[PDB]
Each structure stands twice: as C-alpha cells, then as structure tokens.
Design a protein around this ligand. Sequence first.
Ligand SMILES: CC(/C=C/C(=O)NO)=C\[C@@H](C)C(=O)c1ccc(N(C)C)cc1
Ligand SMILES: CC(/C=C/C(=O)NO)=C\[C@@H](C)C(=O)c1ccc(N(C)C)cc1
Ligand SMILES: CC(/C=C/C(=O)NO)=C\[C@@H](C)C(=O)c1ccc(N(C)C)cc1
Ligand SMILES: CC(/C=C/C(=O)NO)=C\[C@@H](C)C(=O)c1ccc(N(C)C)cc1
Ligand SMILES: [K+]
Ligand SMILES: [K+]
Ligand SMILES: [K+]
Ligand SMILES: [K+]
Ligand SMILES: [K+]
Ligand SMILES: [K+]
Ligand SMILES: [K+]
Ligand SMILES: [K+]
Ligand SMILES: [Zn+2]
Ligand SMILES: [Zn+2]
Ligand SMILES: [Zn+2]
Ligand SMILES: [Zn+2]
Lengths: 370, 370, 370, 370
Amino acid sequence: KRKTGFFFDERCFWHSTGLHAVTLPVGGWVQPPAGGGHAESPETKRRMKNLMDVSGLTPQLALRSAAPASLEDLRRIHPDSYLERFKAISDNGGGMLGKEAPLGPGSYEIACLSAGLACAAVEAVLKGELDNAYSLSRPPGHHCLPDQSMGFCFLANIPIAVERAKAQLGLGKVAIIDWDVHHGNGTQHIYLQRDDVLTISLHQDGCFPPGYAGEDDRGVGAGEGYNINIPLLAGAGDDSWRYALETIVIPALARFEPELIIIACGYDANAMDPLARMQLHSDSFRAMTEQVQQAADRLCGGKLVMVHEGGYAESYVPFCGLAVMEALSGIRTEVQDPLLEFIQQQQPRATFAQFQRQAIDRLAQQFGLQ
Amino acid sequence: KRKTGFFFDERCFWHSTGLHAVTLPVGGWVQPPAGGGHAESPETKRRMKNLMDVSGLTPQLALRSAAPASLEDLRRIHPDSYLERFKAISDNGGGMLGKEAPLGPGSYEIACLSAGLACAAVEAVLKGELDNAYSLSRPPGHHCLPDQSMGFCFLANIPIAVERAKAQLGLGKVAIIDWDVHHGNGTQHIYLQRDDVLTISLHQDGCFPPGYAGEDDRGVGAGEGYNINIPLLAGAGDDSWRYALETIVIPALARFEPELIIIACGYDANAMDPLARMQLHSDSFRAMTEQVQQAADRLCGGKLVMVHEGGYAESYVPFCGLAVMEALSGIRTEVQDPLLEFIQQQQPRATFAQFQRQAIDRLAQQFGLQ
Amino acid sequence: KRKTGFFFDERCFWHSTGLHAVTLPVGGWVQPPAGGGHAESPETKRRMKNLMDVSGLTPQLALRSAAPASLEDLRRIHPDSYLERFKAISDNGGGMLGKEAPLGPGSYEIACLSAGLACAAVEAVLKGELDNAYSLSRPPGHHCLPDQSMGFCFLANIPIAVERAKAQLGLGKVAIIDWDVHHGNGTQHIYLQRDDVLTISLHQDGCFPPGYAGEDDRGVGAGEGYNINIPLLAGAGDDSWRYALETIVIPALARFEPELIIIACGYDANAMDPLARMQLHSDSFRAMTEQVQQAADRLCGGKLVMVHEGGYAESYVPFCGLAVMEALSGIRTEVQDPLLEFIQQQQPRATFAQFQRQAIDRLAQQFGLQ
Amino acid sequence: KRKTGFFFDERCFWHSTGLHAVTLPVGGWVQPPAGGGHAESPETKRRMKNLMDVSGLTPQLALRSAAPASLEDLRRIHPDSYLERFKAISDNGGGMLGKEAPLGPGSYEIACLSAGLACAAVEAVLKGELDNAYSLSRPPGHHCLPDQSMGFCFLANIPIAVERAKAQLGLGKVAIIDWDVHHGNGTQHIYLQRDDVLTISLHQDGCFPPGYAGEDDRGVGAGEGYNINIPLLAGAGDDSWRYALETIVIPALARFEPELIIIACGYDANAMDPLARMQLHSDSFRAMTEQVQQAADRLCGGKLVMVHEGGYAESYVPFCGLAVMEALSGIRTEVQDPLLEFIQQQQPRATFAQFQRQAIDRLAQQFGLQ
Ligand SMILES: CC(/C=C/C(=O)NO)=C\[C@@H](C)C(=O)c1ccc(N(C)C)cc1
Ligand SMILES: CC(/C=C/C(=O)NO)=C\[C@@H](C)C(=O)c1ccc(N(C)C)cc1
Ligand SMILES: CC(/C=C/C(=O)NO)=C\[C@@H](C)C(=O)c1ccc(N(C)C)cc1
Ligand SMILES: CC(/C=C/C(=O)NO)=C\[C@@H](C)C(=O)c1ccc(N(C)C)cc1
Ligand SMILES: [K+]
Ligand SMILES: [K+]
Ligand SMILES: [K+]
Ligand SMILES: [K+]
Ligand SMILES: [K+]
Ligand SMILES: [K+]
Ligand SMILES: [K+]
Ligand SMILES: [K+]
Ligand SMILES: [Zn+2]
Ligand SMILES: [Zn+2]
Ligand SMILES: [Zn+2]
Ligand SMILES: [Zn+2]
C-alpha cells in the first residue's frame, strides 16, 4: 500500500473527432457506420474508470483533477503558429489540423487539460505528496510533434509536463518508457539531441508510423546513446515484451540513473486490439508495471508516473488498465480477467518465442547492454 | 469475364446473438456496451454487399438466393438431438446452445438458409450453370461440430452442401481450402477419416480453438494424408500467406486431383481485425483468389466455390471482399482500397519473412510436398 | 394488383451529416454520443426496404433506380450561387451550408440522385409505364428553399421533378399533399404565386419550422386559394388525421381537378417519433394512402406518386412504410405490426377527438369547403 | 443554498435488458438494430451526471451512495414468490420475468441498490442531515406491482423506502407526486386502500399503461380521496403541466398536510421523448421543482426527496435533469439549454391551452379542490 494518485477529469471524455468507420474517415468508398463512429473513443478510458469504481479500487486511491496546462507550458514545446492553428480549428467547431488530424469543438481546451493532468501527476510525485501516479490523459500525446498533430495526438503531454518540472521543480535526469504498441515518435523527436532524458520505445515493428522500426536511431549530438527503440515482431506476446523489458530497459535505466521514471502507458498491445497485432493480456501489463515500479524503488525512491496513451479494444482495455492500477497501488481487487486464460493459450509457441528472444539479445548487444 | 454467381439473402442479416461487449458476454465484470453489442455482426457482410453495389460490380454478377437446407440435408451431418436442441432454443426466443454459443429468435431457420445458399452455390457450379460462385453465408459454419455449436457457427455449411452434392449430383473428390484465420476444426472433424475430401486449413497458430496448431493432425485410417494444417505465425502478412499457398496448397491440390475446390473464405486475417493478429490487405485476398482460381482452371475446369466465414473489421472487410469478388469475376471496378498502401508499409521485414518461409518449407517437407 | 414502381438506390444511404447527439450538434454542453451519432439517419429507410424484402413484397414491385437530376433540372428551382456553395462544401469533405445544415463528403451528388429518383418516378407514372410509384428519396426535400438548406433538406426534390415534367412531358395541374408531420415550407414557397399547383400541408401546429401554423397563408396573386395549411394539434392521432383528409384534402382535390397527385410522404407523425408529438400507427398510413389512391382513381386515372420525406423512429417507421407500400401496390403481406394494438389503445379519447374535429371543421369552412 | 444530497452509484448503470430495436424486442419482423440496442438505457442517466460534473454543480452537492435494500425491506412490499423468481432469472444470466419484463445478469442486486439509494435519500432528509435529496435510481420503480414487473421496473423503489421509513424512523403522512409522463400504477396499487399516503400522478392520458386515464380512481375504503390521477392531453406543454400543479397538486398537498413530499421524477414528458407526446422543456422541470420545493417549505420544513424514474431522450434529458438539480440546490450554473427557445416556440397555441386549462378545472372540481 503506496499512496497512489489517479488524475482524471470528466471533460477529457468530451473530446471528439467527427465521423469515422472505425478509424477510417467517411467518404469516397467508406460508407458511414450504421452506429458508433469515433476514431479515438472515450469509451475505453471511461470503461476502465467504471471498472475501477465497481471493483472497489477507486476509493483507495488519491483522486485528483488539475488546472489545464498554461500557454507558457505549451510554449516550452510547441511554437505559436501550431498552437494558434489548433485553437482556431477548435474554436470554429472542429475540423482538420492538416490531413489525418481530426478534432472537434472545444478540443483545444480539452487537450490543455489532458496535458495539465500529466503536469500535476509529475509534480505531486516529485514533491513527495504521492508515491506514484496515473494520469488518464485523453487526448494522447506520444505521436505529437512540436508543429504537427499525428496519431490522434494534439499536444505533447509528457514532454510538456517534463519541461515544466525542469523549469519549476529542479527536475534533473528523467527516463520515459513508452510501451504503447506504436512508436513514440513525438517524444523521440523532442529529446533526440538531449542527454538529460532517456526515451525508450517498445513498439511493433512497422506499425505506426507505418514502416518505421528505428533500432539504429540512437540520438544525435549530445543525445547519442540516449534514445532506444525496440521494434518487436508483430505477433509477439507476454514472454517477448517482458523479456525486452528485463534484458534492455531495466539495464538501460540502471546505466542512466534517473530521478523519475515516466511510463507512456498504452494498452494497444493487448491481444484484442484492432490497431496492432501483439498478444498481451492483463497479467502482461501487471508484470511490466511491477518491473518498472521495482526499478523505480531501486533508482529514484519509488518515483513513477504513468500517463495513458492508446488502446482501442473497448471490452478488454479496462481489464488491462485495472491490472496496472492494481499493481501500481499494491491493491488486488476481486476482479478476474475473463479472457486471461484464453489469451494465455493463444501465446506463440517456443519456436517464435526463442526467435524473438534472440532478436532482443542482438538489440541489447547493439546498444551495449550485454 | 466468367459467369460468377453471388448467393445472398437479406434474411441472413437478421440473425442475432444477444448483447455482447465486442465478443465478451455482458455480466459480472463486463459492463454492457454503451452502443452496439453484436458478437457476430451483420454489418461487415452488409457493408461488403453495399460496396459491391455502389462500385457497379453487382449488376455484372448472377444474383441468387436459395431454398433453405432441408432437414434431410442437415441430417447427413448432424444428429437430431443437436438439431432439436438448436431449434428449441431458436423457437423459444433465443438463448444459449451450451456455453459460448449464443443465438437469437428464428436463428434456426436463418442458419438453414445460410447452409442452403452454400448448397445452391455448389450445385450451380457443378451443373455448369455458373463458372464459379460466392455464397454470403451467415451465420458461418467452419467451427461447427456435428453435435456442438462453436465459434459463432451453428450448422456445418460447407459439409452440408458437399454431402448433398455427393448424394444427388454424383460429386467425387473435393478439396476444401480454409483461409479464415481460425482453424476449421468442424470441417477437419467431419472429414478426418475420409479420403474423398482433402481439408486444408491455414490459420494462426493457437488462435481459435485456442492453443491448437495441428501440423501433426493428418487424418485417421483411410483419411491419413488427407488433412493438412498450416499454423502460420501470428503477425504474418501478405508474403507469408501467399508463400504457404504456392508452396503447400497448390502442390497438394495437384497431388489429389479434385473435381471441385471450395474455399472457406474468411477475411479475419486482415490487418485490422480484432479476432486475430495477421497482416493481410485486400491485395492479399485478391492474390490468394487468383492462385486458387488458376488451380481450378488447371484441375477441374475452373470449378470454384467460395463460402463466407469470418471477418470482424467493419470498415476494412468490405474492401477485402470486393477484392475477392473482383478477382473471382475477372472484373476490376474503380475502387481503390484506402488502406492498401498503409498496410503494405506495415508488413514484417525480411528477418521475420525468411523465418516464416523456412517454417513453411519444413511443413511442406513433413507433408511430402518438397 | 397495380403495377407499382419502387425507386431506390443504395447510394442514397451513403449520405452523412457529421456527429450529432440525436439531432443536437455536438459541442458546448452537448456531450458526444457514446454510440450512433446521425442526425438524419439512413437506418429508418434501409430498415423499411429490408422489411419489404423479407416480407416477400419487393419481388412483386417494379424496382428501379434513376439517373441523377441534371444541373439544368436543378436550375429550374435553385440559383447557381446556392448550388455552387452546396457543391463546394460537398467536394471539400462536408461541413455546414449556413447554420443547422450539415452535410458530408459527396452529399451533392447523392442529393442529385435523390432528386433524380423523384424525377423518374413522376415520369414513369405520367407516361403510363407504371400505375403508381414510390421514391425512397434521401436526403429529403420538402423544407428546402431555392437558396437555403433547412430541416436536413438540400434540394427541392418534388419541385424539381414537377418542374421537369412541366417542361418535358406537358404536365398540367398537379396537387402535392404533404403528410410529413412538419410544414412543407419549401414546397409552399416555391408554388406560392402559382395556380397550376395546389400545395397542401398537414402538419403539427408549431413544430417545424418552429412556431409556424400557417392556416391564413393561402397563396399570393394568381396563387391565392392554391395553398392549404392544416395545423393539427400536437397529440392528435388516427381519427384526426384521417378526418382532416376526408373533410379538407379530398374535397380540395375534387375542386382543383389535378392530372397528378404527389404525396410528400413522411412518417414522422408516427406515435414513437422523437421529432414530433403525433400518434399515428401503420394502419393510419395505410388508410391515408387508400384515400389518396382512391381520389387519384376518381380524378387522374389512378396517377399517384409518393416521395419519402421524414420519419426518425428506427424500429417503427419500417412498419409504416411497408403499410404504405402494401396499400399502394394492393398486396398484403403476412406482416403484422407488433405495436398496432398498443398504439390504438393510446389514441386520444372523444373529448380531444371532438375538439380537433371541430377545429378542422372551422378550417374547411375558412377555405370554402363546407 | 440548501444542503442537497445526490445519491448515485456507478453499479446502477450496469443493469441491462438484452437486445431491442429502440424498445421493441428483436425477432419476428423486428430486425436487430445495426447499433445500440438498449430498451432502458443507462446513457440518459449517465449523461445527466456527466453534465452536472462539467458544469461545476457536482462539487457543490452532498454525494452519496447507499447500502442496498435488504430482503426485509423488499418484503414490506413484495412477496417472496416474486422476489425469488426475479433473483432466479438474474442469477442465471438474465431473461424474462413474464412477458415484456427483460433483465440481465446481476439485475437483482442492482435493483436492490437502486431501491437502497431511494431508502437512504428519504432517511437523510427525514433525520435532518440534508435539506433535500435526489436519488439517481436505475432501474426505475413506479410501474412495478408487488408481484409483477412492468414498464422496465422490477422493485417498487419509492414504496420500499417509504415503508422502511414508517417502520424505522416514525414517518407519518407522506405525499408522492409522480410527474413521469406515464401512470404510476405501481404506487397507486400499493397505497390504494391507505390514507397515510397521498399518491398523485400526472400523466399522458392513455400512454402507459395503455388506455388508462384513471380520473375516477380515487382510492378504496380508508383510501378513498387519497389517490389523484390527472390525465393530461397528449401534446400538452409547459403551460398545462404547471397549471395542473398550481390548480390541483399544491391545493391537494395543503389539504393533506404531509411530513414529507417525494417526487417520482421522470423526464419523459420532455418535448423530444420517443415514449410519450408531451412538450416540456428544461424550464418546465425547473418551474415544477420550484413549486414543489416551495410547498415543502410551507408544509414540512422543506423536506423534499426526488427519485429518478423515466426519460428516454438521450441528448435532451440531461438538460432537464440539470435544471431540476439546479432548482433543488438553489445553484444556477452557466449552462444554457440549447433547445429551450426552440421548444418554447413549439408550445401549443391558446386554443389548445385554454381547452386543457378547462379540463384541469373540471378535474379539480371533481376532486373538491375548487
Ligand atoms: C494512427 C493509429 C494509431 C494510433 C495510436 O493508438 N497511437 O498510439 C492507427 C492506424 C491503424 C489508423 O487508424 C489509420 C487510419 C487511416 C489511415 N489512412 C486513411 C491511410 C491510416 C491509418
Ligand atoms: C471465437 C472467435 C472467433 C471466431 C470466428 O471468427 N471464426 O472463424 C474469437 C474469440 C476472440 C472470442 O470472441 C472469444 C470471446 C470470449 C471468450 N471467453 C469468454 C473465454 C473467448 C473467446
Ligand atoms: C428539423 C427537424 C425535423 C425535420 C424533418 O423531419 N423534416 O420533415 C426537427 C428538430 C427537432 C431538430 O432536429 C432540431 C435540432 C436542433 C435545434 N437547435 C440546435 C436549435 C433545433 C431543432
Ligand atoms: C413501457 C414504456 C415506458 C415506460 C417508462 O418510461 N416508464 O415510466 C413505453 C412503451 C412505448 C414501450 O416501450 C413498448 C414496447 C413494446 C410494446 N409491445 C411489444 C406491445 C409495447 C410498449
Ligand atoms: K534523449
Ligand atoms: K511505444
Ligand atoms: K479428409
Ligand atoms: K483456416
Ligand atoms: K400553389
Ligand atoms: K406536412
Ligand atoms: K393512497
Ligand atoms: K406520472
Ligand atoms: Zn498506440
Ligand atoms: Zn475466423
Ligand atoms: Zn418531417
Ligand atoms: Zn415514464
């Protein structure tokens, strides 16, 4: 029993993105969906929170909202030309922020809140008010570039919070581990030339951005050696993800000695996700959380923040999220994941598993960790 | 330009299955979905048909319905105790046909129609009225056992049609190739001891039934050598599926010399499916159709029937289906798959590809085809 | 058994309108809907067609599509400034055609088709190819003004067809009876000064446009006496609507002696509609169709066209539509409306009924028909 | 600024009812809905709560849950044969509690909670812990009979709470005013022979139960004069409902002198509801709440509890609910109902209004209040 913060706000569930057929834009040869048409849907996030409430976990956590991120907070990462364009589109009823970047009315102010929840989570943990913290930040941040929206992300949530903590709370070295199944291209870009932040991304080889693996992208100038990409094979499951973490990430954290670990916590590597091809189950996410909590215990006095990114499986993500929040709080509810055993049976056999283990061995050797 | 039959009936879209959160049954810790709750949804199938209509393809096909399969047709595969129980549940408003087998009111008569469309497709092609044919059979059939519903399947559609054509149309040897991403366990069971039907299943290793691969299950007694399972690795994409077909399936058809090829045609290996982890795109399905049409040209005077099975990606399956129907008819519409290039970029790199190629080489050697 | 045309096209179901919470625009204090968000939804229209197919009625009808209405057809009603603006918005991905007028990508070409179905229905009946005809025209037309979209209507479907038949088929006098529950303000405006068309609207007093009754709006100049508005009381049911028709509309048709009767056929006076407060059931719509078919038998050699307008009750409109198509074709299927008896029991008691009868008496006296 | 209790629990939103097309059961000629299929949907209730949160009202209220109603609580109203049957169906995965009474897995325990929220609301107000209180009780109660489920109601929520307060808190006379648009037949039956409770129902003449008005049903034996039914005319709006309240209900409360007023608070008389034909807007519900709060100020030291019943308009009910909670708390947020002015314009003209006023005059004279 740690004191665990859960930062959320009902207004984050109000952001919308127009009419899509799953995640395809309607029009041309894409027929409008007969029902639901939300690209980045609030339902997964709300269902996680709803399950935390009925399981009895929520009253045992420290619940918080936050003030939105200020214009000054945003300007540590983003230029005003981008910000002004995003706000213009938001203020005028929603629309497109260049192609494939759909937002809705009031999305600007809801993105600032999202980023503000991450800012406050980082601060509460840094000041010792909380041992650790989870931010239910929607819309997500990890694909966002300084001057370009991408992958449903409009502001760089984690970098905004980190930059703000560097300027106002004397934060030093920080490691950002991104286990959303997609590549954290926005985080990578922002800290590419910087040695005061270690950015690690585990992701499906080639998934999004499409065709990017990135094992050879290590950082530039002072930043060289401070960016790690682990492109796992599509189809990998629990054994592979946990081995990448044991074999690459924990050793890399040990070498870098951070003052704070931040997880970019997506659940879209879960076995039922339509936006990737990985095979994780809720125990996978429980075990990964355990491993990074333990690292944090060893390295930075238990200081761990998690910020929600992706996950599109509407009925399965809540179990994965509850599992994380259970591991992070050290409280186990009575909930039993009704798919766990089914997904355990689907996991890749030893041939694939050994092959992926070998690929991860080669990566750790390439990064000087073996 | 072949004369291509498309067998469908509006009533097949009326079958329902109760309230699910995606495919999880509601209750316990599964919250009811805020919108749509259909496990096996008509929308994918209807959207395929809708796209065939607006693209201008439908008027170029021979459209047909059928009479439902008779009780006598069904009794060539299923015992009366199963049939009577299914009909009882259907007649009484729907319910459960043992656990994980949900059906709705009138589902019995709609399953008989579904099976009847497959019966008529097979017959029209066998009697030379059509060169080839597609049946939009819902509910699906390939998981159904003689006395047990499974995987959303209630009657064994393809075996019913095949048994009926053996009894009434002098049908001899027939090959059934199942490229739904899941294992065709129902077909396998029914023809396991039989040498007059070759059952081939390509499927994701371990997906459904969960934990089953099956490479060593080859047939029993007279049936030995007449069942082929190809458990591809989760994550495999276009290169792998087409290589399994070139390297195992076409050679196996050449050895067996059928009078008719039947595809159990699922689209749930498409890259956006929540019910498996494969990475096929619409050109994948186009190329696989081409390869089996060409085989049929070489072996049985072009006689090819395809029967719809699975596929859960609501916005993507229609493009995969249109692609098949375009390849089967030899008519190319103006439709361009808006995801094709994106999914091509996501395909596994050469390391994985060569590894899966090697695994398929070993399988073909084990089955005496190399 | 008449020869009855049913004009429809799958592409009309592809028009979309963005994200609404029922019919409220999302944003501000309107939370995005957790599921379906279609203001003017294709589902009601598709469900009607689906029910006509499974009941066995569809094969007994003459099914037709049409060529879209040409630019020249549209310019008999609409100026180019409006048309160009509508097309611009459509061509650029959808948007707003002034406030409360939402459309989607490609809506222009789908509106032209909709209007084209009405054009062709009118022509087939006028040339004696069909005895009568129904057009499943979506999007609807009756609220559209020459230069302004309103009430989900973008082109004036019926006026376009009528103007075209006047220019190319020597059409003379025509009566347009609008029993959509809302006021046919677009039709009224277009023919207000004209004595060659009688426009009658039955509508809920004050519903839409909001606050408009219109009993005193009779026509202007040559058009005076050629426009009839019957503002029925909210809450009125079967007895009232059928009495308005017996007492006002049929006598008005007798006085005017048309060559063609066109019904603007909405079903949003049905007892389950969220967009008005009337209490009609499927037998109501059956009886109203009978009365106008009989009038047409007496006045213009049975020449009757019906064009779909409104109706938002997703589960109930199909029964109302099937009823109309049954009455118009003279074919009764086996379908029994499962709500009919329930809605019959809800109908207003004699106090209200006599009061509304008296109000209609006064209207007919004001219009010189009693 | 009163101290206002809001009693709610996330688990009440988890109750489900199977697959319906709006509120029609699927099967036969009712096609399954392509999206959402919830007869009694949690979305209206959740959206009200969500709007209370984003408007800033929620933190100003006293938020509470409750213990479920005990078996002993339930047995003051319901016999064990009914209870055991309801629980059996709930425990076995859901089903039907006789015809048209659909429930889902775990619905029993969720109905007990619902009733428990009402019990606790009544108690907090009676013991002076709160000035007034609202219970977001789902599933609803007012149609439920002792031994029969009806109108989506499974336990008699308000009678259970009232009977419990009579047995444990020395509660005397209580008035129950039911302004859900449907008849409160369950409440009426339970207190029909009793003079210690005044049951008043305003409802749409004939709506549900279908064909029931009830002006002549006044009570039986000791209960005679203690039951008042006001069957308003379908179509009535703000003026009519508020006049029925001024002219019948407040005078009837003055005569009876209660210790507690309980509102059975449905919102299904709102102008956009598909389950009735009334024309109320959010200011209607605000004004009705004001009038009964003021009565309570005059008669029972401000003691007022409201228990949620019906309301099916998903986008409009939240505004009606927020309005009530604003009037009950005495706190006005910044929210402005985006439909208010539109619905004000739709209201029936003076002819209808005077006619309904006269009908209400006659009712008050029949009940000895004029
Ligand atoms: C962006 C994303 C996930 C983000 C997230 O979860 N961030 O981590 C996934 C892909 C499948 C997607 O939705 C998409 C849609 C349309 C399209 N084209 C029209 C070319 C290309 C891609
Ligand atoms: C059956 C199937 C696909 C069939 C098809 O497409 N046939 O080819 C897929 C799986 C994901 C599924 O839906 C499921 C649901 C619940 C569950 N448990 C409650 C244990 C276990 C599995
Ligand atoms: C237009 C229409 C029906 C048309 C049709 O059926 N034509 O006959 C109905 C009304 C209820 C409507 O949807 C609406 C929505 C929003 C709004 N404001 C935001 C002020 C005002 C009105
Ligand atoms: C029960 C109710 C509202 C309750 C509520 O809001 N309580 O106050 C409304 C009616 C419209 C309904 O849904 C219905 C459905 C089916 C049916 N038959 C199949 C005959 C008859 C009626
Ligand atoms: K870095
Ligand atoms: K990642
Ligand atoms: K075999
Ligand atoms: K297969
Ligand atoms: K006129
Ligand atoms: K009208
Ligand atoms: K009483
Ligand atoms: K009532
Ligand atoms: Zn992601
Ligand atoms: Zn499958
Ligand atoms: Zn209308
Ligand atoms: Zn009600």
